[PDB]
Design a protein around this nucleic acid. Structure first.
Lengths: 44, 49, 49, 305, 49, 73, 102
DNA sequence: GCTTGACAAAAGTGTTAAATTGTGCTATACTGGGAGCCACGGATGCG
DNA sequence: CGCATCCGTGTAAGCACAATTTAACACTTTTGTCAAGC
């Protein structure tokens, strides 16, 4: 249950813990199939 | 650097700031600031606070 | 390469500047590779030679 | 001023631009140092040794070649800016163009040949232009288009401009197909591939408060009335008709995978028991005939659009 | 704004790999800093992208 | 298709067509008599937008009487 | 205006009392961090996997190492050898050595 | 009610051709951008 | 120690070759289907 809200300071470890996978490429989607490109933005 | 390189370490950019933070200690600054605050007859009182 | 968070660099006043005892327009130059800065100096070496 | 372009422009001038009789020694030393490294590698591989004087000389020339390469790069950094300044306005940052031209300059230095007698300025220009063009093709659009398709788009655009200037009026898809030796549908496809997206952050409504994304429907939203009714199907079609038929519908649960999720072929549901393929083939038709009866058929009419 | 951060971050990794002289590497680091600053607060320092 | 939908299709004598219905329909609260229709076709050299094959416009005319809530002045 | 998320949304009921069997495999990365991945009972577990930390890790079981058949990347030495031969550069190295002595 | 065997149609394996994408090369000389059509509060030197 | 003024701030590729992905074709296995009989 909600009791209080805390706003700390985020370090590299916190960001890596939140992260599910590193973005390696600026790709967003395929220009022809329009599917998201792997290892980039919008990566499934 | 080429005359006295081993006497010191220098850098620039965010890397130097990161290193300064690693080798920096917070306690001494707080103690010095408190001392200046309790002895700040001049303008340094406001800056120290 | 390490990068500093802009909010704390020039937070009006510079939080990082106050913490590191670097005045405005001097910490700025270090961040943007406009000047060098000494991270550490070895006093032990100079005593020997 | 805080402009980073100015900081780079007022920095590359620390090294004076070279001349024909000053740059040759740079490539000479670069090659000498690289082959000094090769001789050292051979020495390590073959277990050879050299006099300390020769070893020191070889290492010193290796360092001298590294220094000469660095000096040549710093001296020619100005050419990179002088060449990349032209590509402004395409849609890429000026400094990124400068740095990609610097990569091209590094490649040119790696592949320069003084023995041909030509000047470095002539040879490095091609590499710098190639690097800038590669950078523009690879990373100038939010949706990346391969290099060959980018070249096709550029050719189509140039031909379109030429035809428009010649005829004044706008061209037609048939004219583009005739000129480019491709079908008009292919011309339309290229035009679509060259179409750039817009940003949802743009203001809308003739006032600065609203944003474009405010008035976009969610076509994939889960309509409640359907979402509920589907579950009601799991109560009716999935359940009651099965209770009144026993295994005549129990096999159907395996047929379409109502249990465990797998629709299964006749053999798979038959081979595990003592019923043959043809018998299940008959049973399926019998069940279909049974459920076609008006008493059962009328109930489910409303669950099919 | 995200792509800007990625592209440069990749290019730096090439420049360090190729062992370019410190001028280009420093310029790349400065642009990376500027790109991160624009990503967080566009226009807080210099002209906005 | 979900297995229940396939079963329901098997119960009846219908099959799923490859097409979605996106027909034009009268907006909510609107009614009247159709008084005119105008059609433009790409097949007839009409000045249609790019990628548009056909355009249809329908005019609906309704006679409104004075009723509660209407504003007079 | 209406649009699409380049995807589809359904309403099939979610369940947890009947699920596939999982044989979790743990991969260790070079930096020392370990990550677990649940794979189906079909096995065919890859020898290496791309973990959350952005770099590839090897299966902890200690099997299926790579032979490193990948073709070595080109470098400055290759670009240098094509434009000039060994003898011409042996002569150059001898010339440079002579100047140092002088 | 259930099984056997021949038959037609649909679903797999594998080879091959083709379209689609990624990387490298071009040697007269060319070497330092060009855009551009404000008021308020907090601080420091001076009297 | 207070006030006047300065500063920070919210106009110019195209080709070649190699590598990957996708389709077209051919045959083979599997599935559903039909009749007839056990």
């Amino acid at each position: 249950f909600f009791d209080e809200l805390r706003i700390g300071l985020a370090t590299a470890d916190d960001i890596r813990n939140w992260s599910y996978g590193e973005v390696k490429k600026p790709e967003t989607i395929n220009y022809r199939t329009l599917k998201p490109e792997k290892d980039g933005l919008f990566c499934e | 650097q080429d005359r006295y390189g081993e006497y010191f370490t220098g850098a620039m950019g965010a890397e130097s700031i990161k290193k300064l933070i690693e080798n920096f200690d917070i306690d001494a600054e707080a103690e010095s600031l408190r001392e200046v605050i309790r002895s700040g007859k001049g303008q340094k009182k406001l800056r120290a606070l | 390469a390490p990068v500093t968070h802009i909010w704390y660099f020039k937070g009006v006043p510079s939080r990082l500047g106050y913490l590191l005892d670097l005045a405005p327009k001097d910490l700025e130059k270090i961040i943007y590779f406009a000047a060098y800065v000494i991270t550490s100096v070895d006093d032990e070496m100079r005593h020997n030679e | 001023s805080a402009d980073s372009v100015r900081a780079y422009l007022k920095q590359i001038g620390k090294v004076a631009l070279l001349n024909a009789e000053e740059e040759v020694e740079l490539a000479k030393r670069i090659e000498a140092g690289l082959y000094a490294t090769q001789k050292l590698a051979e020495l390590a591989e073959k277990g050879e040794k050299l006099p300390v004087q020769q070893r020191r000389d070889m290492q010193w020339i290796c360092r001298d070649g590294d220094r000469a390469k660095n000096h040549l790069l710093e001296a020619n950094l100005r050419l990179v800016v002088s060449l990349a300044k032209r590509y402004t306005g395409r849609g890429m940052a000026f400094l990124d163009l400068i740095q990609e031209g610097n990569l091209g300059l590094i490649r040119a230095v790696e592949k320069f040949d003084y023995t041909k007698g030509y000047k470095f300025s002539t040879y490095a220009t091609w590499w710098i232009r190639q690097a800038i063009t590669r950078a523009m093709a690879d990373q100038a659009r939010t949706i990346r288009i391969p290099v060959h398709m980018v070249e096709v788009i550029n050719k189509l655009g140039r031909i379109q401009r030429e035809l428009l200037q010649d005829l004044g009026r706008e061209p037609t898809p048939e004219e583009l197909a005739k000129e480019m030796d491709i079908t008009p549908e292919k011309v339309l496809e290229i035009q679509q591939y060259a179409r750039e997206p817009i940003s949802l952050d743009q203001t809308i409504g003739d006032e600065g408060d609203s944003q474009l994304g405010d008035f976009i429907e969610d076509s994939e939203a889960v309509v409640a009335v359907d979402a509920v009714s589907f579950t009601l199907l799991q109560d009716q079609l999935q359940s009651v008709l099965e209770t009144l038929s026993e295994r005549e519908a129990g096999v159907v649960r395996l047929r379409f995978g109502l249990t465990d999720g797998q629709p299964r072929t006749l053999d798979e549901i038959g081979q595990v028991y003592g019923v043959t393929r043809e018998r299940i083939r008959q049973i399926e038709s019998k069940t279909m005939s049974k459920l076609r009866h008006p008493s059962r058929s009328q109930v489910l009419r409303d669950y099919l659009d | 704004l995200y792509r800007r951060v990625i592209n440069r971050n990749n290019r730096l990794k090439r420049l360090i790999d190729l062992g370019a002289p410190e001028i280009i590497v420093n310029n790349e680091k400065r642009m990376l800093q500027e790109s991160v600053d624009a990503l967080f607060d566009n226009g807080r320092r210099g002209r906005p992208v | 298709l979900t297995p229940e939908e396939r079963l329901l299709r098997a119960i009846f004598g219908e099959k799923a067509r490859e097409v979605r219905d996106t027909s034009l329909k009268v907006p909510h609260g609107e009614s009247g008599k159709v008084i005119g229709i105008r059609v433009f076709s790409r097949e007839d050299d009409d000045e249609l937008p790019a990628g548009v094959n056909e355009l249809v416009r329908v005019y609906v005319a309704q006679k409104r009487k004075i009723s509660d809530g209407d504003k007079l002045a | 205006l209406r649009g699409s998320r380049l995807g589809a949304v359904s309403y099939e009921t979610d369940r947890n009392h009947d699920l596939a069997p999982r044989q979790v495999a743990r991969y260790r990365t070079d930096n020392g961090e370990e990550f677990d991945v649940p794979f189906a009972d079909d096995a065919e577990i890859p020898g290496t996997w791309l973990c959350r930390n952005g770099l590839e890790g090897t299966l902890i079981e200690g099997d299926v190492p790579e032979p490193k058949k990948v073709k070595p990347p080109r470098t400055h030495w290759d670009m240098l050898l094509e434009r000039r031969s060994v003898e011409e550069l042996e002569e150059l190295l001898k010339e440079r050595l002579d100047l140092i002595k002088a």
